[PDB]
Amino acid sequence: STELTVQSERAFQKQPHIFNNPKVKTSKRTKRWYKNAGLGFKTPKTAIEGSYIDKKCPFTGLVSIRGKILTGTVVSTKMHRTIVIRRAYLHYIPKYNRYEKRHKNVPVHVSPAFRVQVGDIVTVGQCRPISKTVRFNVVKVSAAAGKANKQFAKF
Amino acid sequence: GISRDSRHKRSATGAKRAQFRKKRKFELGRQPANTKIGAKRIHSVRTRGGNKKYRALRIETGNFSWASEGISKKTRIAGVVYHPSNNELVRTNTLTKAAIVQIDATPFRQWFEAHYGQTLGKKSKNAERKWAARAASAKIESSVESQFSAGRLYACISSRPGQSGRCDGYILEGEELAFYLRRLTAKK
Amino acid sequence: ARGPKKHLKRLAAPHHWLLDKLSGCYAPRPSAGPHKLRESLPLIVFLRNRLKYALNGREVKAILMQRHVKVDGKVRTDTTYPAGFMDVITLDATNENFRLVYDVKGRFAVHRITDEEASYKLGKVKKVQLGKKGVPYVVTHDGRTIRYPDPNIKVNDTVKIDLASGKITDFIKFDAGKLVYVTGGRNLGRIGTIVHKERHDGGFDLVHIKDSLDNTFVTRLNNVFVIGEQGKPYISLPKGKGIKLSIAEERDRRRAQQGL
Amino acid sequence: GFPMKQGVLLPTRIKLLLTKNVSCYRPRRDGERKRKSVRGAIVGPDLAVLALVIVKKGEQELEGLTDTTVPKRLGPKRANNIRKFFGLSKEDDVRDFVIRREVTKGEKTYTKAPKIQRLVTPQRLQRKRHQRALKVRNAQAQREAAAEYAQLLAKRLSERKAEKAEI
RNA sequence: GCCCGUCGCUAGUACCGAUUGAAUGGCUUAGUGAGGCCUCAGGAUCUGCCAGAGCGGA
RNA sequence: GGACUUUUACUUUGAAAAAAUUAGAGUGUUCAAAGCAGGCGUAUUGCUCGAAUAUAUUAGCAUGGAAUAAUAGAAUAGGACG
RNA sequence: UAUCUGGUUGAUCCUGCCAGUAGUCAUAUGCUUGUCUCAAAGAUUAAGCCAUGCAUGUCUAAGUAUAAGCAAUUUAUACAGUGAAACUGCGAAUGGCUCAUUAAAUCAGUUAUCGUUUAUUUGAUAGUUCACAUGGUAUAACUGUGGUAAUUCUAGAGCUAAUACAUGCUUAAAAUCUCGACCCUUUGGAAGAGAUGUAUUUAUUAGAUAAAAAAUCAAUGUCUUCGGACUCUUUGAUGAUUCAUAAUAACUUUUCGAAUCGCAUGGCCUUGUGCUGGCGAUGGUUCAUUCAAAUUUCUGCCCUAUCAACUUUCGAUGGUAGGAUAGUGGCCUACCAUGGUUUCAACGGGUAACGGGGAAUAAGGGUUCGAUUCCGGAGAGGGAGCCUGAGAAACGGCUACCA
RNA sequence: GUGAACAGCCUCUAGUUGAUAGAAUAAUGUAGAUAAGGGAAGUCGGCAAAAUAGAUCCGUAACUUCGGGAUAAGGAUUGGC
Ligand SMILES: CN[C@@H]1[C@@H](O)[C@@H](O[C@@H]2[C@@H](O)[C@H](O[C@H]3O[C@H](CN)CC[C@H]3N)[C@@H](N)C[C@H]2N)OC[C@]1(C)O
Ligand SMILES: [Mg+2]
Ligand SMILES: [Mg+2]
Ligand SMILES: [Mg+2]
Ligand SMILES: [Mg+2]
Ligand SMILES: [Mg+2]
Ligand SMILES: [Mg+2]
Ligand SMILES: [Mg+2]
Ligand SMILES: [Mg+2]
Ligand SMILES: [Mg+2]
Ligand SMILES: [Mg+2]
Ligand SMILES: [Mg+2]
Ligand SMILES: [Mg+2]
Ligand SMILES: [Mg+2]
Ligand SMILES: [Mg+2]
Ligand SMILES: [Mg+2]
Ligand SMILES: [Mg+2]
Ligand SMILES: [Mg+2]
Ligand SMILES: [Mg+2]
Ligand SMILES: [Mg+2]
Ligand SMILES: [Mg+2]
Ligand SMILES: [Mg+2]
Ligand SMILES: [Mg+2]
Ligand SMILES: [Mg+2]
Ligand SMILES: [Mg+2]
Ligand SMILES: [Mg+2]
Ligand SMILES: [Mg+2]
Ligand SMILES: [Mg+2]
Ligand SMILES: [Mg+2]
Ligand SMILES: [Mg+2]
Ligand SMILES: [Mg+2]
Ligand SMILES: [Mg+2]
Ligand SMILES: [Mg+2]
Ligand SMILES: [Mg+2]
Ligand SMILES: [Mg+2]
Ligand SMILES: [Mg+2]
Ligand SMILES: [Mg+2]
Ligand SMILES: [Mg+2]
Ligand SMILES: [Mg+2]
Ligand SMILES: [Mg+2]
Ligand SMILES: [Mg+2]
Ligand SMILES: [Mg+2]
Ligand SMILES: [Mg+2]
Ligand SMILES: [Mg+2]
Ligand SMILES: [Mg+2]
Ligand SMILES: [Mg+2]
Ligand SMILES: [Mg+2]
Ligand SMILES: [Mg+2]
Ligand SMILES: [Mg+2]
Ligand SMILES: [Mg+2]
Ligand SMILES: [Mg+2]
Ligand SMILES: [Mg+2]
Ligand SMILES: [Mg+2]
Ligand SMILES: [Mg+2]
Ligand SMILES: [Mg+2]
Ligand SMILES: [Mg+2]
Ligand SMILES: [Mg+2]
């Protein structure tokens, strides 16, 4: 998703209070603000090198990561600039002294810093409410391939 | 009245939620100001915990900053040429945040040709002094320049007039003024 | 629930108050003030249950309305006033001076001081902020806002205070090896010496502690109140000085010396 | 018994919502509005009683009205109010110009009078002088406390430059 | 010896059943829609900056 | 402080944990259910011990463990180190 | 605190139930009832209905007293004692009661506010404003004349107050900015004029630190030991921010910056009722603190498939923008995307379902209950709507409907 | 031209204006209209009559030979610029 047009909305997309003076001629054009989210999390290169905009991007945006931090694997990429992860986990029934498989499906807004794919585990930091569903934000991507290369052409 | 509660609506699963308790005064919402131009008239909502807010409707004047000139002057608002949310706001010339207006340019033209003297478009002792200390910065931009002939400048409302009672904002400049310039005459 | 609650049922009352089940319905509700509801002593629980000077509540007001009581030099005529840690309660009759400080069992103590020691008190800086027009201000667990302080004062430190005016007369840093008071946690009331502090970016710094019997424990950084330098407390400690003998070692102290 | 409330422009009785600061309603709680029954403002045969104020006299005096005369209840209380009842400007010292009322307890006949409010008193200027006093006396003491800092930190920077010598 | 099913007397329970049956409680399309609130107006009379006049306030 | 780190289950320890209830120490309510009192002289001007402790578990946080059980890696090398 | 006994056969050992036995912080009932201490109690049915009474009022030396009130004597020709009424203020959002609703709701433990509001308490914080020996009316109580069968119903007329209503003066030093009459040709310098508290809205600049050095371009700071040269003055917090804080240009039906009250009355002359000054009350903006609030993270419920697909008429999932709110957020609105849940049981149905602390039963494991003394949530016949206020969607507040 | 249309209504080309006539406007008729409130009580019987009506969007039961029932039922909308 994202991945072109930068301007595609009827609204002109820009970072708040980051001003490019027209009279002062710059060869970089855009002056692009960022930070590092903290909590020992790398603000990735593409957040800086990128041309993108989104204000829900915890590195270039106005949302701050605090509270829980969660691991889980991506089951759905179908939404633009957000995704749903399945964090499974086991539940202990005291009577039977056993465990039963459970899961909870967490929608989380993926900044357009990351290329996320289905099957990739992802680390996710908690943030302020973003959409109806999403209280969490993609932070680190733990799987760069997930078998992608082992599928290969004939010879 | 209006309620911003999520107790209405539905589940994320798409389940109907039952009616639980009632509306509370703190889930509350109120009507749109739908602020307009002309004849300044403003009503004041008394909000949660004292905290007056200020309802703009009919404001004909507001303070607009020149982004790259580091100066700000209050002007007239001449209309609305664009708006990203609904086109009906441009037609009705309703004033909202991020609404694209036209302003005056004359308080900006009076000030530029004083601070500089370059007579957009188109003798005192210490005057020629600072006039000469200036320029080199007098180039401005063609796209702000050419506007000045018409006598109306493209501004953008940066405030929330129904909330704050004021209509303020900045002159469209650089990339924005470049972008709206497309949709402006690619719609008109 | 439509407003702030103005009562306290006497069960949900904090138990370090040590109030009997029957004999009433409600606790007194600590007023708003320097100290928090859960952690505080209202003068009524003090002038009545602790010090037994006033039998009624009726007597506690008939006392306080004579100006006799005062806290940190100010008179304090309100019955439910939320007195608490480090506070100095001075009766001008009886010429008694008390500092309100914790036992090892966790309650507040009735602990006298000199006419002198009464005139200063510690507080823990709860944050260091830069106020309006540049003035940095420091603020304390008891709610004192103090401006123009020493730049070497940081959060979690402690401060000596004048109580006549309010100025800072000294500041003790937070460094490994400082005498320390535990306010909060089960270890609340234990005392002294700070062997280590575990970082935990993301909150809740753990602090090891060893008293001098050479016993060791841990609490939250928030529960650590720096009282001074090793072996020297800046204020008068009470009997036992926050050690915690086990229930058997307190059983031998009682089953031997005092009385029979 | 329903009263007339002007402004309705009706011969008829209608019900309305009544608030603070309108007639026929005496609100009994803060913000209490109550629906009452108001009689219209236009006259009709239906009124048991009518209220009339005389704009001009007439060639015949009327027994209990033009013939007789009543005292006002209370005299001026506010200082300048006595001043502008009698027209004294600010010199004439309105104290002895207060109005006094008699009364008699079993031949003990006595006297009483207002307390002139917003009077200029020596006590009242002592406070005014005191207010301009505290405000300036406070003002400078904060400037000196500010200089105590500007000394404390600047002489902390002369400790930080002199420790570079230790390096 | 045990023992089965129809038939038949008595009592109880449930079922199916015309009545386009009935009642209770809860959601709901559509139609109508009190009321307060927001807003556009209005302006009984009453003031603002003794013939009279302008444009703001109640 | 920089630069990175395959991810799990489990088990240790801890911090944070309302009272009342419960288990339970103390105290002779005259016994007792209780209650959290009281107990000592110099009983005409005071002294003084108390109001303990434990339980709290599934989840959350912090920590020692690396067995059992999952999980990922180099094979059309698009491999590892410098 | 790990226990069985009786009942199928002619007898038998089994299966398996019935019955016996035991306790119940479990109700009911019946017989019987002397004493001390302790004390549950119209929850279960019907959150069904209600006659009457009562359950929320409130004043200090200290906001307003001319009661035609009482009372003094005792100093008060302005007032002063005491003080009904009325204005002003605050409270009335606590308490108390009940469990109707409610099954991802509430709740519990655990988080979040870098997502917000907060009277009050506590601690700080105000020289800057254009008659100042202190500026204006407009009113209750009251007085009198009235209407009604009828109520805490009120009308007309005549008074009079304020910490109510509404206005409106004030104060040091210095400094940095802009403009700038003149003379001046030089790197050029200038009297004098305005602006500058705080709050509001906007935009722009600072808010550094990741180890070291160089040419150029425009503007332009501070020193000349006259060619040139040049800072080790700012450096706050957090895991992390556009944070605290600061500065520049303007903006505003300009927020605030005392027109207030109780006690005492003491200095200081150049003797003007001159100029000062004590102990504290009530206030006042901002910040903190506390009392709270509202959302909020992870994980956790009973029966049911004779409920398998659910959600998106008309928000369902997400994006962008605005509106709205105290604030975040499909909270609402425009355009846009086609999404979100489920056999790891969604969705639906039921609950004689408020949830938790806890309760009973005492090998362990379990089973069963919790309306109910504590916490949390809901509601005041049913629904909605709203005024007042810091705080209510209040019901011993109002408005409407249905009953 | 309107319109789904060779419907109806109006028109062009063409073709008629032919059917005893005048004057009145009672009853009773033939043919067409409308009636307050009630709503089949009229009647062998709703006979007659009234109500319905097009399109677009929403919604649709028993039952069934699964093809149907179905325009089921029941709704909302409609001009001009
Ligand atoms: C209908 N006549 C009877 C019928 O009534 C029934 O009777 C028995 C009876 O014979 C048994 O009892 C007999 O045999 C026992 C042998 N130990 C002793 C007691 C004796 N009465 C009972 N225990 C049970 C009844 N249901 O079972 C047997 C039968 C012949 O069918
Ligand atoms: Mg405020
Ligand atoms: Mg921390
Ligand atoms: Mg934190
Ligand atoms: Mg037979
Ligand atoms: Mg049946
Ligand atoms: Mg409807
Ligand atoms: Mg448990
Ligand atoms: Mg029994
Ligand atoms: Mg007997
Ligand atoms: Mg009942
Ligand atoms: Mg009832
Ligand atoms: Mg008095
Ligand atoms: Mg009152
Ligand atoms: Mg309550
Ligand atoms: Mg219920
Ligand atoms: Mg204060
Ligand atoms: Mg006031
Ligand atoms: Mg950094
Ligand atoms: Mg900002
Ligand atoms: Mg800021
Ligand atoms: Mg007064
Ligand atoms: Mg969105
Ligand atoms: Mg919001
Ligand atoms: Mg129920
Ligand atoms: Mg239950
Ligand atoms: Mg349990
Ligand atoms: Mg319960
Ligand atoms: Mg009860
Ligand atoms: Mg309620
Ligand atoms: Mg209903
Ligand atoms: Mg209902
Ligand atoms: Mg209600
Ligand atoms: Mg009631
Ligand atoms: Mg109530
Ligand atoms: Mg009905
Ligand atoms: Mg009913
Ligand atoms: Mg056609
Ligand atoms: Mg045709
Ligand atoms: Mg012919
Ligand atoms: Mg014929
Ligand atoms: Mg004829
Ligand atoms: Mg004739
Ligand atoms: Mg005829
Ligand atoms: Mg007709
Ligand atoms: Mg009809
Ligand atoms: Mg009809
Ligand atoms: Mg009908
Ligand atoms: Mg018929
Ligand atoms: Mg019929
Ligand atoms: Mg018939
Ligand atoms: Mg018949
Ligand atoms: Mg027939
Ligand atoms: Mg027919
Ligand atoms: Mg019809
Ligand atoms: Mg139809
Ligand atoms: Mg038309």
Interface touch C148/D145, C-beta < 8 Å: yes
Same domain, B144 and B157: no
Distance, CA of B142 to CA of B144 (rounded, Å): 6
CB atoms within 10 A of CB C156: 19
Same domain, C112 and C126: no
Q: How many CA atoms lie within 13 A of B24 on its CB side?
A: 13
Same domain, B61 and B80: yes
Distance, CA of D76 to CA of D115 (rounded, Å): 10
CB atoms within 10 A of CB C235: 18
Whether residue C191 contacts residue C227, with contact meaning beta carbons closer than 8 Å, is answered with yes
Same domain, B39 and B77: yes
**3-state DSSP call for residue C170?**
strand
Query: C124 φ, ψ to 5°?
Result: -95, 125
Whether residue B99 contacts residue B33, with contact meaning beta carbons closer than 8 Å, is answered with no
Residue C257 lies in a domain: no
Among B139, B74, B76, which Cα is nearest to B112's? B139
Distance of CA C74 to the CA centre of its chain: 18
Residue C40 lies in a domain: yes
Whether residue A82 contacts residue A108, with contact meaning beta carbons closer than 8 Å, is answered with yes
Same domain, B36 and B86: yes
Method of determination used here: X-ray
Residue A59, exposed/middle/buried by CB under 10 A (0-12, 13-18, 19+)? Answer: buried
Count how many domains chain B has.
3
Same domain, B132 and B44: no
CATH number of domain containing B131: 1.10.168.20
Residues 110-139 of C with CB under 8 A from D: 135
Long-range interactions of C31-34: CB distance < 8 A, separation 24+? C31/C78, C31/C80, C31/C81, C31/C82, C32/C82, C33/C81, C33/C82, C33/C143, C34/C82, C34/C83, C34/C84, C34/C87, C34/C142, C34/C143, C34/C144
Same domain, B91 and B147: no
Q: Which CATH class is domain A5-144?
A: mainly beta
Domain boundaries, chain A: 5-144
- Ligand 21 centre to CA of A62 (Å) is 15
Whether residue B112 contacts residue B121, with contact meaning beta carbons closer than 8 Å, is answered with no
**Residue of D138, D142, D143, D149 for testing the chain C interface, max C β-carbons within 10 Å:** D149
Which two structure tokens, joined as six digits, stand for C112?
A: 């006298």
Residue C252 lies in a domain: no
Whether residue C193 contacts residue C178, with contact meaning beta carbons closer than 8 Å, is answered with yes
Structural domain boundaries enclosing C21: 1-116
Non-local (6+) Cβ contacts of C227 within 8 A are: C122, C158, C172, C178, C179, C180, C181, C191, C192, C233, C234, C235
Question: What's the gap in Å between the CA of C132 and the closest CA on chain A?
Answer: 24
Same domain, B140 and B69: no
Non-local (6+) Cβ contacts of C189 within 8 A are: C102, C103, C104, C105, C106, C182, C242, C244
Whether residue A146 contacts residue A47, with contact meaning beta carbons closer than 8 Å, is answered with no
DSSP string, chain B: -EE--SSSSB-TT-PBPPP-S---GGGEE-------SSS-EEE--B-SSS-B-BEEES--EEEEEEGGGTEEEEEE--EEEE-SS-THHHHTT---TT-EEE--SHHHHHHHHHHT---S----HHHHHHHHHS-SSTT--HHHHHHHHHT--EEEE-S-HHHHS---EEE--HHHHHHHHHHHHTT-
CA-to-CA dists, residue C235 to B117, C113, C189, angstroms: 73, 9, 15
Which two structure tokens, joined as six digits, stand for C248?
A: 């058997």
Whether residue C156 contacts residue C221, with contact meaning beta carbons closer than 8 Å, is answered with yes
Same domain, B41 and B100: yes
**Complete edge-to-edge strand list for the sheet that includes strand C178-182:** C178-182, C224-229, C232-233
Which two structure tokens, joined as six digits, stand for C224?
A: 């650590």
Question: Cβ contacts (< 8 Å) between A39 and chain C: which residues?
Answer: 201-202
- Per the structure, the residue whose CA is closest to nucleotide G379 at C1' is B21
A68 to chain C: nearest residue by CA? C202
According to DSSP, the residues that pair with C127 across neighbouring strands are: C139
Which two structure tokens, joined as six digits, stand for A120?
A: 């990739």
Q: Which bases of strand F have any atom within 7 Å of the beta carbon of a protein residue?
A: 3-10, 14-20, 25, 35-37, 39, 48-53, 58-59, 61-63, 73, 75-76, 78
Same domain, C189 and C221: yes
Using the structure block, give the residue that is written with the tokens 């002489």. D155
Distance, CA of C253 to CA of C240 (rounded, Å): 12
Non-local (6+) Cβ contacts of A9 within 8 A are: B84
Instruction: Kindly provide the resolution of this structure in angstroms, with one decimal.
Output: 3.4
Which two structure tokens, joined as six digits, stand for C165?
A: 């005016």
CB atoms within 10 A of CB B160: 19
Same domain, B95 and B131: no
According to DSSP, the residues that pair with C208 across neighbouring strands are: C196, C218
- What DSSP element (H or E) covers A122? strand A121-126
Largest interatomic CA distance in chain D? 114
Among A81, A69, A67, which Cα is nearest to A113's? A81
Structural domain boundaries enclosing B88: 31-105+152-188
Same domain, B19 and B93: no
Among B88, B89, B103, B93, which Cα is nearest to B37's? B93
- Ligand 3 centre to CA of B187 (Å) is 55
**Complete edge-to-edge strand list for the sheet that includes strand A83-93:** A98-108, A83-93, A69-76, A121-126, A136-141
CA-to-CA dists, residue D98 to B28, D71, D75, D82, D111, angstroms: 56, 17, 8, 7, 12
Whether residue C139 contacts residue C147, with contact meaning beta carbons closer than 8 Å, is answered with no
CA-to-CA dists, residue B165 to B2, B95, B161, angstroms: 21, 11, 5
To the nearest 10 degrees (0 to 180), the angle between helices B174-185 and B142-150 is 50
Alpha-carbon torsion (A117, A118, A120, A125), positive or negative: positive
Count how many domains chain C has.
3
- What DSSP element (H or E) covers D149? helix D122-162
The C-alpha angle A5, A6, A12, rounded to 5 degrees, equals: 115
The C-alpha angle D9, D13, D15, rounded to 5 degrees, equals: 95
Burial B8-31 (b: 16+ CB within 10 A, else e): eeeeeeeeeeeeeeeeeeeeeeee
CA A64 to C1' G340, in angstroms, rounded, equals 25
| DSSP class of B48 | S
Which candidate from A9, A14, A133 shows the least CB-CB separation from B12? A133
Residue C255 lies in a domain: no
